[PDB]
Amino acid sequence: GSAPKYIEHFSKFSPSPLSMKQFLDFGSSNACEKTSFTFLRQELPVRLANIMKEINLLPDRVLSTPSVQLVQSWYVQSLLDIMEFLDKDPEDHRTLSQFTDALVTIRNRHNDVVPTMAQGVLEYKDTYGDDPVSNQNIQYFLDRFYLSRISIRMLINQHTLIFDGSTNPAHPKHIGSIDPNCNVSEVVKDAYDMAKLLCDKYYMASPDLEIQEINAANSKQPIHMVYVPSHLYHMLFELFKNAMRATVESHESSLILPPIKVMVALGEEDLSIKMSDRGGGVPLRKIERLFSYMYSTPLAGFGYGLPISRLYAKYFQGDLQLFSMEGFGTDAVIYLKALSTDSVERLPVYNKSAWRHYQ
Amino acid sequence: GSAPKYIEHFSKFSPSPLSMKQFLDFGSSNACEKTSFTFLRQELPVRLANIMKEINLLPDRVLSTPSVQLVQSWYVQSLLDIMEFLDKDPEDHRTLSQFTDALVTIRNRHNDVVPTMAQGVLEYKDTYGDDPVSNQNIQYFLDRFYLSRISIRMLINQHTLIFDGSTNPAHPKHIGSIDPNCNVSEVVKDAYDMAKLLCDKYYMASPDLEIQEINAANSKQPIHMVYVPSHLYHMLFELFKNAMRATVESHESSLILPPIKVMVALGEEDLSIKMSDRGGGVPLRKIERLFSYMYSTPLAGFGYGLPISRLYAKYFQGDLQLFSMEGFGTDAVIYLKALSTDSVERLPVYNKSAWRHYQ
Numbered sequence: 271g272s273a274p275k276y277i278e279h280f281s282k283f284s285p286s287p288l289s290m291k292q293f294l295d296f297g298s299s300n301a302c303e304k305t306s307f308t309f310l311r312q313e314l315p316v317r318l319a320n321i322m323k324e325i326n327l328l329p330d331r332v333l334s335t336p337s338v339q340l341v342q343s344w345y346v347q348s349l350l351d352i353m354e355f356l357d358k359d360p361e362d363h364r365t366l367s368q369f370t371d372a373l374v375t376i377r378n379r380h381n382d383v384v385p386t387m388a389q390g391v392l393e394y395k396d397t398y399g400d401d402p403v404s405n406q407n408i409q410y411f412l413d414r415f416y417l418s419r420i421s422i423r424m425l426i427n428q429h430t431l432i433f434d435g436s437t438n439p440a441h442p443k444h445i446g447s448i449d450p451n452c453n454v455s456e457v458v459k460d461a462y463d464m465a466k467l468l469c470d471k472y473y474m475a476s477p478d479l480e481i482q483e484i485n486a487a488n489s490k491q492p493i494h495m496v497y498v499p500s501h502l503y504h505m506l507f508e509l510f511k512n513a514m515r516a517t518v519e520s521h522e523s524s525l526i527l528p529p530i531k532v533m534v535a536l537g538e539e540d541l542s543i544k545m546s547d548r549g550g551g552v553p554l555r556k557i558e559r560l561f562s563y564m565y566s567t568p569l570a571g572f573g574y575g576l577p578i579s580r581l582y583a584k585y586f587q588g589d590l591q592l593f594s595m596e597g598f599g600t601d602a603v604i605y606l607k608a609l610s611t612d613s614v615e616r617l618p619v620y621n622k623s624a625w626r627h628y629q
Numbered sequence: 630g631s632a633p634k635y636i637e638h639f640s641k642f643s644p645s646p647l648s649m650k651q652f653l654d655f656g657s658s659n660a661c662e663k664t665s666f667t668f669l670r671q672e673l674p675v676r677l678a679n680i681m682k683e684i685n686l687l688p689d690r691v692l693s694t695p696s697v698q699l700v701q702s703w704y705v706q707s708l709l710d711i712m713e714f715l716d717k718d719p720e721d722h723r724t725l726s727q728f729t730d731a732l733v734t735i736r737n738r739h740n741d742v743v744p745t746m747a748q749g750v751l752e753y754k755d756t757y758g759d760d761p762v763s764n765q766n767i768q769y770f771l772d773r774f775y776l777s778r779i780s781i782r783m784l785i786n787q788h789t790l791i792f793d794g795s796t797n798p799a800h801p802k803h804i805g806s807i808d809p810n811c812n813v814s815e816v817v818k819d820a821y822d823m824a825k826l827l828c829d830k831y832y833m834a835s836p837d838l839e840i841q842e843i844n845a846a847n848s849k850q851p852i853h854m855v856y857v858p859s860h861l862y863h864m865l866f867e868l869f870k871n872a873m874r875a876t877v878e879s880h881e882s883s884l885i886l887p888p889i890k891v892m893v894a895l896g897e898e899d900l901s902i903k904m905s906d907r908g909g910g911v912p913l914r915k916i917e918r919l920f921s922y923m924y925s926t927p928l929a930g931f932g933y934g935l936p937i938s939r940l941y942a943k944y945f946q947g948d949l950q951l952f953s954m955e956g957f958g959t960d961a962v963i964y965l966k967a968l969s970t971d972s973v974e975r976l977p978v979y980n981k982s983a984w985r986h987y988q
């Protein structure tokens with residue numbers, strides 16, 4: 271009977287953004303679950319509390335929905351779940367192995383949040399309508415809610431993956447979900463192949479791929495970076511699925527089926543990935559709506575592919591944009607930060623500032 | 630001693646947006662300066678008053694500057710200038726020929742507004758600094774101020790050009806500044822040639838041009854539209870100058886000098902023009918600043934080429950965007966509305982809504 275108390279307390283702190291370097295040293299040298307354990311015991315409760323504090327200030331008409339209420343209960347339970355370790359002592363090789371098991375259990379407990387929240391969006395649409403204002407509010411809330419979730423899952427995956435149990439491997443290519451030497455083109459190739467498979471099965475035809483690299487400072491060196499490869503895969507995959515669908519459907523009474531071209535450019539601070547297709551394009555007017563949760567609610571189904579992929583890009587100070595040419599095709603660009611130094615977590619925070627965005 | 634009275638009165642009305650069709654019929658059939666005269670006598674004072682009402686609510690620290698004060702005096706005089714005809718009778722072939730002369734005199738009186746206002750921006754920068762907030766406010770104000778000016782000059786040019794004196798020509802290709810059959814590629818070609826000339830004189834080297842059309846519905850028909858060609862020329866010219874400078878300066882220790890490629894695509898509602906260069910690109914972080922009046926204050930000099938070109942595009946419901954690839958190049962896209970029906974003036978209005986954007 272004290273969750274409201276915990277929430278209000280940790281709701282006083284601000285989340286602490288970690289850089290890609292800190293993440294690397296967290297699993298590298300300093301790496302002793304004790305250091306991580308002591309960090310996550312306070313950090314997770316601060317991040318959970320902050321997003322929960324935001325939820326509770328939602329209109330009661332949204333608040334009371336079975337969707338929001340159910341999800342809101344998982345976060346309350348997860349908070350209390352991690353609390354158990356606030357007073358424990360980390361020298362006990364069993365106190366921290368229970369923390370690891372506690373994390374894995376919290377992660378899977380939230381595994382269906384997107385679909386669940388999506389259901390609440392649909393109810394609202396039929397219960398109150400889809401007006402620019404309610405859309406802006408939902409968009410504002412979901413973008414922050416989901417970004418927060420991405421950051422929390424990152425902390426948990428880094429801990430669970432890194433402390434699997436003993437250091438046999440000792441010295442790895444990867445540090446949890448992070449690859450200090452990620453070959454961008456390879457990930458492009460992978461996401462493409464997976465999309466192609468789906469495309470062939472459903473349309474029994476699929477455009478090919480062309481890749482071009484532009485290493486500004488070192489003309490012919492392959493482009494590598496420090497990043498979370500699974501995150502990059504997700505964005506590329508969602509983009510490849512859209513490009514394929516459009517290209518195929520727009521050339522049905524045509525035999526020709528142009529390829530999808532990808533360019534990977536590396537500058538002094540940006541690492542840019544552009545995916546160009548000829549799937550007919552979209553009118554500038556409808557582009558804005560493609561990133562909407564409300565308005566966007568085989569290969570395609572719901573409308574979370576674009577908006578959530580953007581959040582992944584933004585997570586480490588990057589971005590994802592779309593510019594099309596109705597009657598021809600579309601360019602989708604993923605902007606990432608080239609230097610591990612500029613790669614720092616972007617986290618939404620609860621303040622008097624975040625309060626008036628709902629007024 | 631009654632300008633404040635006039636301002637407050639006409640400040641009660643909202644400007645009336647005209648469609649490209651109305652503009653065409655205004656000079657076409659209905660066309661009788663009497664019809665235009667009676668329209669402009671009330672419309673101009675409503676548009677002048679609305680922008681003047683906005684100026685007067687500017688912080689006194691901006692208000693009091695010689696710049697703003699001087700410009701503010703021209704608009705006050707122009708208002709009183711047109712007022713003279715509020716009680717006159719239009720059957721007098723001399724009452725309306727004095728209106729025409731009155732317009733030409735008002736147009737030239739405001740011919741140096743941009744430079745003058747720019748001077749006020751520079752003073753503010755050194756007098757109070759360049760912080761995100763003061764920048765946002767200035768940007769907000771200037772975008773509206775200038776759009777308003779573009780709309781007023783459009784009305785005046787349509788009247789003066791159309792009623793030059795007698796209908797010798799009787800039946801023209803053009804209706805004032807509007808071309809009901811504008812060949813986009815031709816205007817592209819013209820702006821390119823003018824930019825090339827300047828580029829050659831200053832750098833004694835210039836990239837070439839390639840043009841590609843994509844007529845979705847009619848594969849090989851040349852792309853025509855109803856538009857104000859001088860406006861399109863201006864945007865293309867400013868874009869060509871940037872693309873040329875960048876391309877040349879970024880390949881100085883290179884002999885190769887890649888071309889500037891332009892694509893003109895015509896869809897069901899959009900007519901898009903993309904200009905692609907290989908001038909090295911810009912970091913995503915600095916792109917935002919390129920459209921700033923404050924932050925942007927040979928070929929290039931001041932920083933009004935981009936922001937003002939965007940206003941021209943927005944004027945008839947279009948847009949102008951920039952997306953770059955640091956280490957490679959940049960894409961600049963002009964979005965226009967394909968159908969004359971969707972081509973309607975976009976005008977800023979003074980309301981309680983426009984008031985709180987300065988708070």
Ligand SMILES: Nc1ncnc2c1ncn2[C@@H]1O[C@H](COP(=O)(O)OP(=O)(O)O)[C@@H](O)[C@H]1O
Pocket residue numbers: 508512513516547549550551552560566569570571572573574575576577599600
């Ligand atoms: N490259 C593209 N060309 C044309 N339309 C596109 C493209 N990418 C996305 N879209 C449009 O945007 C919408 C997709 O957003 P998304 O969030 O990925 O969901 P989904 O693909 O499951 O419908 C599509 O439904 C499609 O109408």
Ligand SMILES: Nc1ncnc2c1ncn2[C@@H]1O[C@H](COP(=O)(O)OP(=O)(O)O)[C@@H](O)[C@H]1O
Pocket residue numbers: 867871872875906908909910911919925928929930931932933934935936958959
């Ligand atoms: N295609 C481009 N490639 C690289 N930089 C560009 C490009 N277009 C514009 N810029 C940058 O944006 C700025 C220009 O904005 P603009 O308002 O046109 O003013 P100006 O060209 O007179 O400086 C330039 O000063 C340049 O630094």
Ligand SMILES: [Mg+2]
Pocket residue numbers: 508511512569570571575576
């Ligand atoms: Mg998709």
Ligand SMILES: [Mg+2]
Pocket residue numbers: 867870871928929930934935
């Ligand atoms: Mg310029």
